[PDB]
Write a protein that binds this ligand. Structure first.
Ligand SMILES: *C/C=C1\C(=C\c2[nH]c(/C=C3[NH+]=C(/C=C4\NC(=O)C(C=C)=C4C)C(C)=C\3CCC(=O)O)c(CCC(=O)O)c2C)NC(=O)[C@H]1C
Ligand SMILES: *C/C=C1\C(=C\c2[nH]c(/C=C3[NH+]=C(/C=C4\NC(=O)C(C=C)=C4C)C(C)=C\3CCC(=O)O)c(CCC(=O)O)c2C)NC(=O)[C@H]1C
Lengths: 495, 495
């Protein structure tokens, strides 16, 4: 499941933490690596006095002064033009997600990004210097996309045209936290991840959780050593420094090794957040090291928000059509059922077509003291056994794309009843939809969820793995389930 | 109501249409004025050949060539560098909302904005030339706002800082299509519209409908004469030219007169769209004529989308808290009711506090063959009469902030029962919440809805009008209504 809290994390390695393997990678404290990426510099100063507390060891390269020299100095002295503005944009108690950005001139322009975590100020320094109307045209192009897929294509195309990344993907999450590449823009000859599904373990729970709050992260060079902070612990608390809000945060070694195994030299992703949930990612790859300029990144962030809105719109539409047809069918069935004196004969009416309602191949109707069937159904003893299994079921509605999971002794009923959609009307009487077993191949990107726990480190295989799943049927559309509940209410109230 | 289609419009004035008054202003064809604003130029060319069909009479000022000369020429000749790109960005059959923008160099840079309507291409020409990180910082500021009001304040502040407009407002629509200024950024001494409500007639249905699809519109000079198209009719159809997608579209004379009456020299608004509905406007005013540059407008449009998302987020939160408390109370009441053998005594229990549930002052419980009350209730005969009136009611749930509207002979029950929230449990038995009459003053911006139909033109009064409404109570929070339905289900299933 994706709607869950992350597992409690281990202490980091510099605090005596355990080595991170695939057995405990869900518990790596990625938000406190105590280090940054070498393409920029980072300061941590007191939120009230502005006294510099922690510094990256490479700060001399960007600031022109040694770490031991700047340590102890106030931001009021180092940045007299930005310090009051810095304080104004980041009032005490503000979310650590709130960022303030400014440009500075120094012996080369430096982009400064500041945010506030607890009683600490985090300052990021990156060297800095696009298309004139590319963003606007992109926004209108996204809004005028006919459907989700077209929207995804427009987004990937646009991001790749703006950045020049070797690969750009729209990665959509599923409720089971697995994801799927639903659009891809790439250079010729480069391997295609389009249409492939990846295990949830590829993006562990704490990573997803972090990515719900902080919407952009990257790895400029997957072979660059991280630059530690000095001191590594926040002097205020003698505790780790929260770097979740810092784009310069050192990437988890596990994901670094993963990217190197994928043949990726540079990575970047923007979160797509819908209704407070992580819907997907704009995932970017480059075969060679690449530091994307802060302004271009800002453009990508704008794209992230626009996409976050338009996804909701397009999915609302794609739902709306099918749901309209569905509701019309519900109107027919409800009109027919209000006047029924023989529920079996009314619901077995070919005119009503209760089978085409859920696109099912089988139907079991149970009313009065008997049951009837329609279409492809299991044998009568199997029917009675199934009805008993529903009598054992506690819920009001049962839904599955594989009955073999819920009911073991019913796994042999897969040919006619692989998928099941049952509803009770106070389990003496009920309606049961059945879908037959289907030859389904899921294209995984190198491994199934079961295979990811086999290697101690990240895998090296990312080519197409066609998992042939059996005992499964056509997945129940959520709309059809809503329709099932609506039908439960209607039939309960009418009968 | 705001969720409704616009009334069928009259033919325009240049086609023998009737004069527009306040009696028929809902039927003005504002989308086809046959003219534009004089601060830019407009062309209409064939969507396939690119042959220029219609031109604004002032096109010589911006293009350097007379209208009769350019008429008949193709866009392939006039814009050889943009014509293929123009065609590529706007494929045939695309929504008329899709816009393509480019910059041109000419003897002064010209901003070109093109869109496609039916078999016609519309091209807009505007002269063109902000803060470095103002937009990004604004986006993070909006996202980190604690609540809807703070969000609104951040938005107005930011827009005013970016544009320099004398007044910037966030105007939020109500279900009855009236609106309210919920935030305002203004120059010192300028009159405040903050906290005022305006009639729906101020923004007529077809205007709102148009503003749901095309998200920005303006009036650069409220005393500038419009520039007609030549020919005024599209040669393709001998019919009016759809200008809904053109920002240069001539503003309705009615709204022009309105703005002049308000003391406004220049106006501009960006639509805030949520779930396909018009949620609100970013309304901008300037006391003097002001042509906002296209790029700054683009910034405002970005702000429009960001706001469209963040509004949904903040409202989701503000709902979520109160709804949480509410659902906890529902858990208590439902737990108590599952074991009840005396519904009256269980629901009259001070421990459960069914009155504090809906913040009501009165409660009528009807069960078995009798009724009990709790708190401030009308006399017993009035109670029986009210129960009878509920027996006459067809619905399952009744909700009103003024019982005098629904029930006339109950308008005298306003002191104890002004607001009513009744629910039936299959109307033999029921629960009724009652809220007492409250002294309510609604600050209107010059007029009530009833007063707007008195003048033949737009009004001149916009100062505070405190309408003292009587027979009304504290408005039922929608959450409380959801809770009422939930309680109906629970009590129906449990009793
Ligand atoms: C539990 C151990 C493992 C694990 C750890 C891990 N991953 C990340 C960050 C990831 N992982 C991503 C996975 C993909 N990249 C792709 O291109 C595709 C599809 C083609 C997938 C499925 C992605 C996108 C990210 C985000 C970062 C980025 O864009 O580069 C982290 C967190 C990294 C950090 O920021 O600190 C961790 C700890 N990955 C495994 O495979 C598994 C062994
Ligand atoms: C039915 C006749 C009338 C009517 C017509 C009308 N109005 C508009 C456009 C409007 N009206 C607006 C109203 C307000 N402006 C404010 O500042 C405030 C609050 C302080 C309100 C309530 C607004 C904002 C617009 C949008 C345009 C803009 O931002 O300037 C139109 C359409 C105009 C067009 O684009 O063609 C029409 C036909 N207004 C009346 O008052 C009533 C008599």
């Amino acid at each position: 499941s994706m709607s869950r809290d992350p597992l409690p994390f281990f202490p980091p390695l510099y605090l005596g933490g355990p080595e991170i393997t695939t057995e405990n990678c869900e518990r790596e404290p990625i938000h406190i690596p105590g280090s940054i990426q070498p393409h920029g510099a980072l300061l941590t100063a007191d939120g009230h006095s502005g006294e510099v507390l922690q510094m990256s060891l490479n700060a001399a390269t960007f600031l022109g002064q040694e770490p031991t020299v700047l340590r102890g100095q106030t931001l009021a002295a180092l940045l007299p033009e930005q310090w009051p503005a810095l304080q104004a944009a980041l009032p005490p108690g503000c979310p650590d997600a709130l960022q303030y950005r400014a440009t500075l001139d120094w012996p080369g322009h430096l982009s400064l990004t500041v945010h506030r975590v607890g009683e600490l100020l985090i300052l990021e320094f990156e060297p800095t210097e696009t298309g004139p109307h590319a963003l606007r045209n992109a926004m209108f192009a996204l809004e005028s996309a006919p459907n989700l897929r077209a929207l995804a294509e427009v987004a990937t195309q646009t991001v790749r045209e703006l950045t020049g990344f070797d690969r750009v993907m729209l990665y959509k999450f599923a409720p089971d936290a697995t994801g799927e590449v639903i659009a891809e823009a790439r250079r010729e000859g480069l391997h295609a991840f389009l249409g492939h599904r990846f295990p949830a373990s590829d993006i562990p729970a704490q990573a997803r959780a972090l990515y719900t709050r902080h919407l952009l992260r990257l790895t400029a060079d997957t072979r660059a050593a991280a630059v530690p902070l000095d001191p590594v612990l926040n002097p205020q608390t003698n505790a780790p420094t929260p770097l979740g809000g810092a784009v310069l945060r050192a990437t988890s070694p596990m994901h670094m090794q993963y990217l190197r195994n994928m043949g990726v030299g540079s990575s970047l992703s923007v979160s797509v957040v819908v209704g407070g949930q992580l819907w997907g990612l704009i995932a970017c790859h480059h075969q060679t090291p690449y530091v994307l300029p802060p302004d271009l990144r800002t453009t990508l962030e704008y794209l992230g928000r626009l996409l976050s809105l338009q996804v909701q719109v397009k999915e609302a539409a794609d739902v709306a059509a099918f749901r309209q047809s569905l509701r019309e069918h519900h109107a027919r069935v409800a009109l027919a059922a209000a006047h029924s004196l023989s529920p079996h004969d009314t619901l077995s009416d070919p005119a009503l077509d209760l089978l085409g309602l859920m696109r099912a191949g089988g139907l079991i109707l149970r009313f009065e003291g008997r049951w009837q069937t329609l279409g492809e159904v299991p044998p009568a003893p199997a029917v009675d056994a199934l009805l008993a299994w529903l009598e054992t079921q506690p819920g009001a509605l049962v839904q599955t794309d594989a009955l073999g999971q819920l009911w073991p002794a019913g796994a042999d009923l897969a040919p006619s009843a692989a998928g099941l959609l049952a509803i009770s009307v106070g389990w003496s009487e009920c309606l049961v939809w059945l879908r037959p077993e289907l030859r389904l191949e899921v294209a995984w990107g190198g491994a199934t969820p079961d295979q990811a726990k086999d290697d101690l480190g990240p895998r090296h295989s990312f080519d197409t793995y066609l998992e042939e799943k059996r005992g499964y049927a056509e997945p129940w559309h959520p709309g059809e389930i809503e329709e099932a509940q609506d039908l439960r209410d209607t039939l309960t109230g009418a009968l």
